Structure 1
Amino acid sequence: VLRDNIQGITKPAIRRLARRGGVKRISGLIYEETRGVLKVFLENVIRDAVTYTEHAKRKTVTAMDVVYALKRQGRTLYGFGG
């Protein structure tokens, strides 16, 4: 079982992602909110991906399903098939 793993997304990783976006200063409360946003986004993508796997009578999530699912969320991905 896995319990309280979202904290594995470290604070320097969020710092690096913000630096990529051009952010100069970062408040201390940003990290928990960012973790929550990432959890919401991942849940939304994973729900559709697991539904696509369940319909095909498969037991493994493939890359194509994840592409199809993000494209269904308006987040089309190039480079992993389609």
Structure 2
Amino acid sequence: LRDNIQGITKPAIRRLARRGGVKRISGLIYEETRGVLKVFLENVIRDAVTYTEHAKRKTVTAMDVVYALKRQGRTLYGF
């Protein structure tokens, strides 16, 4: 399945901005944050799939994902 960048809906972006304390949200920022979320996701996902392919592993586990997040200096607690 392709064209899934539209899955991150505009109200979901608005909720993310409200959590960030944003009062006024432009209509042109939704494409930009979809782009940056996509870029961050390709970075983390490519690190995760390199971790997965290193260990003869075919399904991506939660451990590798958080290890990738930590090696990009964005360590995630709770997994």
Normalising by the smaller structure, the TM-score range is over 0.9
Distance 1:58 1:18 in 2: 36
CA RMSD, 1 decimal: 0.5
1:16-48 Cα deviation digits (max 9, x unpaired): 111111111011100000000000000000011
1:33-81 Cα deviation digits (max 9, x unpaired): 000000000000001100011010011111110011000000001110x
Partner of 1:5: 4
1:77 alignment partner, SS class: coil
Matches within 5 A, 1:51-66: 51-66=50-65
Q: CA deviation at 1:3?
A: 1.2
- Consecutive unaligned residues of structure 2, counting only runs of 5 or more, are none
Moved over 4 A (4+): none
Q: CA deviation at 1:5?
A: 0.7
Distance 1:79 1:64 in 2: 11
2:48 alignment partner, SS class: helix
2:50 alignment partner, SS class: helix
| Superposition TM-score, scaled by structure 2 size | 0.97
| Count, aligned residues | 79
